[PDB]
């Protein structure tokens, strides 16, 4: 089932069916070129474009450089047959990758069946094909066959990376805009790609790579295919509809050319730059064009130039345009079907949806302009796959989009010179005599300022409410399930035939569709300014590579006037520390302190509880970009609290919402029904008005405000990168200043330091993204929406007055219902429709914020060991290798629980990927796992340290070892300097939370501060590891008892995880509560609570008591008896007796399955073991007093007494509750105890039901089930 059903090579001999020389439309005479038919109506011509446009028969650069950010020229590209074969295979591979996805499958299918309309006949009763939509294919015998087609993929023109859709036009018809459609020629190259900067994904992928990221070529092809799909159905937006920009201010760009068609093609937030008025305009325009096509098909009487029947062509176009055919065969356009088709072609065929489907990193908007050009090679499967692209699965490239990172996947991307040279199109910004200091600012580094006329509206135009006035439906955001709805109802069966048409002329005559004449925007415009701009602050933080020591400086002045001075917004103490000359012996500590200070200042966040919509503030944004004005960062914080987000904007945007058009109501005399319908329609149209103004404000916000915030965010990323690079340059100068002897004695890897500063910047960018997003949303909510809400309330007042007059005018007609209609009007119009941001923007759903947090935790795991299906595997994207020993025991009930014995064959080995093995001096990392350590019984375990988890290589790495009441974490560098942290639990204790119980261990390692060990989510100990050098961990992680002298010793372990960052306390608590399996009850040791298993009982209010039965029968009772006693082995353990007292057995009553696992809210029976035989726990609910004394009864003697027990699991999940219920479903109360004289009897009490969960008063009815375990092993 491939889209290309044949293996095509460029040296394959011509056959005239799918491989042949062809001639397409041309201005004059054209040399035939070899082309390949890869699918129906889909041809590929591996040739440079010198024929489609006669003005571009030259592959040399144009007279003036194109006003594009990135351009590349190579007249020698795609000349050799090897290059052409590579091109053909790459295009084939990209088509296969697109067709593999659901959305791409639909897109290609729609392209194939969108045959250009046969509108060439001057006579309305005939159907004649248009020549320019066809080609001539030369046959082996020398004759040529004219064939109609839909799409041709050819190589680029002079500019290699300028990809676009071309089509040959008509004398009078605009085929791409009248619904007809024309054959589309896409200029494309699969051997090159763009390189862009991204910082938004650090929230979910904090391990994002540094430097540029490379666009997946499949996305660019899909973009051009969507252009082709718009053009083939004749619904392409007019290329003179351009989003105008203001180019007069110093901060504004010199000029930008983007089309409404391009904005529609992009989708996402870019498509929302168009208001709803113009969208409805476009929809109705193309609707009437489709109706034109329908009427043309109707008045048709014959076909010309082919052997195919007229009815067949009518059917083909019926399926292309989804026309409705009535009982007489006449065609018409259904509004519903046209809606589906137009929405699918315009709103679903978007680059954003293809980004969602391809699972690749890509720019969220067109304003994230490309920055570099990279040579690639996608044909080899080791470099690029149909299903994964550059992000090859089960490799380092699969995680964090590292396949697209030009620095990590460097063998796949070779940087090329950008022919758009540095500062080719720019503005000259000068600061007045602080003579003039002037900087060139690149055009695409300036601010996008949309013009006001782009946001046209008729909000001030009134409407006439009729009883027939149509109420509109919703506008569902394009979600993935709607795409699936169209996918499941899509028809992939019919494909139009490649019919036989009458032969055209030898040379097809035709020219491209005329493009509007675009003016080159002004360049080099000089501005004379009184204040330093944000561009000056960002420029002052740059420098040139060289030998000379660059020095940091807090004076923007001094930095701007010296190449060897770099401005920094850090503290002056940082400047003094970095610029000082440091000796060799003090070099490593110097670098560590510099890293610590860099991370401290970049991660600085000031929480505010004084303003509503903003919760955090990053202060250094002030001096980083001169946001606002004033001296300190305290000015920035205070002015942000006082004024609001408005200080972050470079231009205050006009949010002009006029007086809303009032409704005029038509009067229907002596007619009750139509009058009440008019009233209802007026109210509904008022609701629609509320939604319309909200949508207009959201569009203005997305175009005018959010773009400025995005540019500020990009510039913050750039400033952080500049600071990091400057610090690295100074440190490496200092290192290189040394004699090479000192350079041998100091093991310094600057790439390691570059990494460390990279993730510090990633954290800083997480904070900056959150803060700036909050600022943009706050400005929308507080500074723009209220103008609306005011205008809307005024409209409500006007509508209320007009209605009330309308109702009192038809008082005779609405006889009796005057009061009800009056109340309806007054009550509906006295309320406000609240503005909900989740309704108009896809980003701001709360569930997505929760998902972002959980993903951020997940995506930091470089190793995640879980038991899936029938094997223990690595669920991380790296997918390391797992070798399971022959004597590794998995728990049959919970196969995640792994038992390791003191045997050589009871071992688990993890072969790590070469890109995730630890070898650094600065990279923090963490580990977490659940371990169950049995009690120690022998004195041979005293002072016997044995490793269980091993990642040591030549005495360097990390290990987890065990000793008598000791969990030990050991770090050791390559210099054999080692540090150990310990958690100690004593065996001389009544009841222990750690002995033979599941323990959640977490070890975090900050290479600059400390190694911390946490138990059950609480910090336990820490040791300073800042004095450790370079650590080289092992290529494999070994789980096995190593050196354990206790022959019968074993451990239990589950849910092992290795993370690439230092977890904070909150994250560790989240992990502890997440991995608790909160839906399942647990026994005392932490395992799964099971049916038909005997459990001794513990009461959490009085742990020193055990359940005993005074007498069997209805006249007897059960009570808590103490003390438990003590079991001991001298100098080893002295613990309370746990196996004392009566036993409970949980019996299945209403279980809908057979697994013997007690889940939450399970209705069960409970048996009591007395003298090694089972009775039933029950009570008489009709006895006086809320406290119902429980008793152990003979099983055949229970009768109709209260016995049904509802179980509850409260957080491990050790805390267990038992709510008793009679046979009528009523509550008897939770099972705890109550004092009767001396004896505390077991009692069902409804007083517990009256207490809030987790309250201290609920600790009396909290229970702990204790089964006999080999880890405890006292005498039963």
């Amino acid at each position, epitope marked *: 089932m491939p889209f290309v059903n044949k293996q095509f090579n460029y040296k394959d001999p011509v056959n005239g069916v799918d491989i042949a020389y062809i001639k397409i439309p041309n201005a004059g005479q054209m040399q035939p070129v070899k082309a390949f038919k890869i699918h129906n109506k889909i041809w590929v011509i591996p040739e440079r474009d010198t024929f489609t446009n006669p003005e571009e028969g030259d592959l040399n650069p144009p007279p003036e450089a194109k006003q594009v950010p990135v351009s590349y020229y190579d007249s020698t590209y795609l000349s050799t047959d090897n290059e052409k074969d590579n091109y053909l295979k790459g295009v084939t591979k990209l088509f296969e990758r697109i067709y593999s996805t659901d959305l791409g499958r639909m897109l290609l299918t729609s392209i194939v069946r969108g045959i250009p309309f046969w509108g060439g006949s001057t*006579i*309305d009763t005939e159907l004649k094909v248009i020549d320019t939509n066809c080609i001539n294919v030369i046959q082996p015998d020398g004759s040529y066959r004219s064939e109609e087609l839909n799409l041709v993929i050819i190589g680029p023109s002079a500019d290699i990376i300028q990809f676009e859709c071309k089509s040959f036009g008509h004398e009078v018809l605009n085929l791409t805009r009248n619904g007809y459609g024309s054959t589309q020629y896409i200029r494309f190259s699969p051997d090159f790609t763009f390189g862009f900067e991204e910082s938004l994904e650090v929230d979910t992928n904090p391990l994002l790579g540094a430097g540029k990221f490379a666009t997946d070529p499949a996305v660019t092809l899909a973009h051009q295919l969507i252009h082709a799909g718009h053009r083939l159905y004749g619904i392409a937006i007019n290329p003179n509809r351009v989003f105008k920009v203001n180019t007069n201010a110093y901060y504004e760009m010199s000029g930008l050319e983007v089309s409404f068609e391009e904005l529609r093609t992009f989708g996402g937030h870019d498509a929302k730059f168009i208001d709803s008025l113009q969208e409805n*305009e476009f929809r*109705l*325009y193309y609707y*009437n064009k489709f109706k034109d096509i329908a009427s*043309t098909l109707n008045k048709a009487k014959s076909i010309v130039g082919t052997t195919a029947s007229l009815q067949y062509m009518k059917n083909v176009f019926k399926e292309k345009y989804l026309l409705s055919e009535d009982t007489s065969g006449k065609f018409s356009v259904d509004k519903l079907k046209f809606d589906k088709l137009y929405k699918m072609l315009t709103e679903i065929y978007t680059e954003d949806n293809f980004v969602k489907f391809f699972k690749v990193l890509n720019a969220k908007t067109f304003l994230n302009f490309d920055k570099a050009v990279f040579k690639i090679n996608i044909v080899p499967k080791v470099n690029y796959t149909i299903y994964d692209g550059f992000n090859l699965r089960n490799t380092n490239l699969a995680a964090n989009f590292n396949g697209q990172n030009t620095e990590i996947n460097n063998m796949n991307f070779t940087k090329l010179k950008n022919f758009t040279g540095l500062f080719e199109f720019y503005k000259l910004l000068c600061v007045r005599g602080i003579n003039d200091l002037c900087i060139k600012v690149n055009n695409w580094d300036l601010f996008f300022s949309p013009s006001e006329d782009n946001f046209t509206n*008729d909000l001030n135009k009134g409407e006439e409410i009729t009883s027939d006035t149509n109420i509109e439906a919703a506008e569902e955001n394009i979600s993935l399930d709607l795409i699936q709805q169209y996918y499941l109802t899509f028809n992939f069966d019919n494909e139009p035939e490649n019919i036989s048409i009458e032969n055209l002329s030898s040379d097809i005559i035709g020219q491209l569709e005329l493009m509007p004449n675009i003016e080159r925007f002004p360049n080099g415009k000089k501005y004379e300014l009184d204040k330093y701009t944000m561009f000056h602050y960002l420029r002052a933080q740059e420098f040139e590579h060289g030998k000379s020591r660059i020095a940091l400086t807090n004076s923007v002045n001094e930095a701007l006037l010296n190449p060897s001075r770099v401005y920094t917004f850090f503290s002056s103490d940082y400047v003094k520390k970095v610029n000082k000359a440091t000796e060799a012996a003090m070099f490593l500590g110097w670098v560590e302190q510099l890293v610590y200070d860099f991370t401290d200042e970049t991660s600085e966040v000031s929480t505010t509880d004084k303003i509503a919509d903003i919760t955090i503030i990053i202060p250094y944004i002030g001096p980083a970009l001169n946001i606002g004005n004033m001296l300190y960062k305290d000015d920035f914080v205070g002015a942000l609290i006082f004024s609001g987000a408005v200080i972050l904007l470079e231009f205050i945007p006009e949010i002009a919402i006029p007086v809303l058009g009032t409704f005029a109501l038509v009067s229907y005399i002596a007619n009750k029904v139509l009058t009440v319908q008019t009233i209802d329609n007026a109210l509904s149209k008022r609701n629609e008005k509320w939604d319309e103004v909200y949508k207009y404000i959201v569009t203005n916000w997305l175009a005018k405000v959010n773009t400025q915030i995005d540019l500020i965010r990009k510039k913050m990323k750039e400033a952080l990168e500049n600071q990091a690079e400057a610090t690295k340059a100074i440190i490496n100068y200092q290192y290189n200043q040394y004699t090479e002897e000192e350079k041998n004695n100091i093991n310094f890897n600057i790439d390691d330091l570059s990494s460390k500063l990279n993730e510090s910047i990633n954290k800083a960018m997480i904070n900056i993204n959150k803060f700036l997003n909050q600022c943009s949303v706050s400005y929308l909510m507080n500074s723009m929406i209220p103008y609306g809400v005011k205008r809307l309330e005024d409209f409500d007042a006007s509508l209320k007055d007009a209605l009330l007059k309308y109702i009192y005018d038809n008082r005779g007609t609405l006889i009796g219902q005057v009061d009800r209609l009056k109340d309806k009007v007054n009550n509906t119009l006295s309320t406000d429709i609240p503005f909900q941001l989740s309704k108009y923007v896809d980003n701001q759903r709360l569930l997505s914020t929760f998902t972002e947090y959980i993903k951020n935790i997940i995506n930091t795991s470089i190793l995640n060991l879980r038991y899936e299906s029938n094997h223990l595997i690595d669920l991380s994207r790296y997918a390391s290798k797992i070798n399971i020993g022959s004597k590794v025991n998995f728990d049959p009930i919970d196969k995640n629980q792994i038992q390791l014995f003191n045997l050589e064959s009871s071992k688990i080995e993890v072969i790590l990927k070469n890109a995730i093995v630890y070898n650094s001096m600065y990279e923090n990392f963490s580990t977490s796992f659940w371990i169950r350590i049995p009690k120690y019984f022998n004195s041979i375990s005293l002072n016997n340290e044995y490793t269980i988890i091993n990642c040591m290589e030549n005495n360097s790495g990390w290990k987890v070892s065990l000793n008598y009441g000791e969990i030990i974490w050991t770090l050791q560098d390559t210099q054999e300097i080692k540090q150990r942290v310990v958690f100690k639990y004593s065996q001389m204790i009544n009841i222990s939370d750690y002995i033979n119980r599941w323990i959640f261990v977490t070890i975090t390692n900050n290479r600059l501060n400390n190694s911390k060990i946490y138990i059950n989510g609480r910090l336990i100990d820490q040791k300073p590891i800042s004095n450790l050098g370079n650590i080289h961990a092992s290529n494999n992680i070994m789980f096995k008892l190593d050196g354990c002298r206790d022959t019968h010793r074993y451990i239990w372990i589950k849910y092992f995880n290795l993370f690439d960052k230092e977890l904070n306390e909150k994250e560790i608590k989240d992990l502890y509560d997440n991995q608790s399996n909160s839906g399942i009850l647990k026994d005392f040791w932490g395992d799964y609570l099971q049916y038909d298993k005997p459990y001794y009982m513990l009461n959490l209010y009085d742990p020193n008591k055990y359940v005993d039965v005074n007498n069997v029968g209805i006249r007897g009772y059960m009570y808590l008896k103490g003390p438990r006693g003590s079991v001991m082995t001298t100098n080893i353990y002295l613990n309370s007796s746990l196996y004392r007292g009566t036993k409970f057995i949980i019996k299945k009553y209403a279980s809908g399955n057979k697994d013997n696992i007690v889940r939450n809210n399970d209705r069960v029976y409970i048996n009591v073991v007395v003298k090694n035989k089972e009775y039933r726990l029950a009570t008489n609910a009709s006895q006086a007093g809320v406290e119902k004394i429980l008793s152990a009864l003979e099983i055949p003697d229970v009768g109709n007494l209260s016995q049904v027990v509802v179980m509850k699991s409260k957080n491990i999940t050790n805390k267990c509750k038992m709510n008793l219920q009679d046979n009528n479903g009523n509550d008897i109360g939770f099972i705890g105890f109550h004092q009767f004289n001396n004896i505390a009897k077991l009692v069902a009490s409804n007083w517990y039901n009256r207490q809030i969960e987790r309250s201290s008063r609920t600790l009396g009815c909290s229970w702990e089930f204790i089964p006999v375990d080999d880890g405890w092993g006292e005498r039963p």
Partner: nanobody
Amino acid sequence: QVQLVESGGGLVQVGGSLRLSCVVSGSDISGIAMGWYRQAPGKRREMVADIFSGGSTDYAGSVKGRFTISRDNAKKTSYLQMNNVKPEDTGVYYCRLYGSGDYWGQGTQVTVSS
């Protein structure tokens, strides 16, 4: 119900000028595109010009540079100014409102005489 009424058609000499107008009743025609088509004797009714509510224009090949389409949303009227007319411009001109329906006018005859 929506109604389109055209006016201003007559016979015109080669190179002369003629102004066609069309008024709308029953709809505000704000945010709604408009167009002028012409039907030659024996040929299909063909697009001549289109104008959007924002004022953007889209012309055919044989008519560009000689005809100018304008509109007034306030007066709910579409205009087509025909300058430097040629014998191919003879036919019945129809106005169209690209709205919720196939809103057409009655049609007015333009004959270029020489």
